């Protein structure tokens, strides 16, 4: 049998992500460049 006669205290770093950057996209302003006729056609696609 093998039994240790000494010991070495060690510290190990562990990296874990908790969150990420939030994202808020204005779909009407993204797809349509503040155009009225573009928004009138975009509204026809439902509630996407």
């Amino acid at each position: 049998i093998a039994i240790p006669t000494n010991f070495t205290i060690s510290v190990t770093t562990e990296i874990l992500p908790v969150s990420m950057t939030k994202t808020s996209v204005d779909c009407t302003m993204y797809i349509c460049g503040d155009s009225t006729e573009c928004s009138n056609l975009l509204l026809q696609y439902g509630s996407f």
Partner: protein, 48 residues
């Protein structure tokens, strides 16, 4: 089958949130609404 009340979606932010949630009663919380945009004051035409 009769219209008992109506909500003007451009009178105040409360009615805008009501129209966004499609409910006359809005509970406590924060809700994202339509983004504000500065409309152009006049038109500028530049040609050769």
């Amino acid at each position: 089958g009769t219209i008992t009340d109506a909500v003007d979606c451009a009178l105040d932010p409360l009615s805008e949130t009501k129209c966004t949630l499609k409910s006359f009663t809005v509970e406590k919380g924060i809700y994202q609404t339509s983004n504000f945009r500065v409309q152009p004051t006049e038109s500028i035409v530049r040609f050769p």
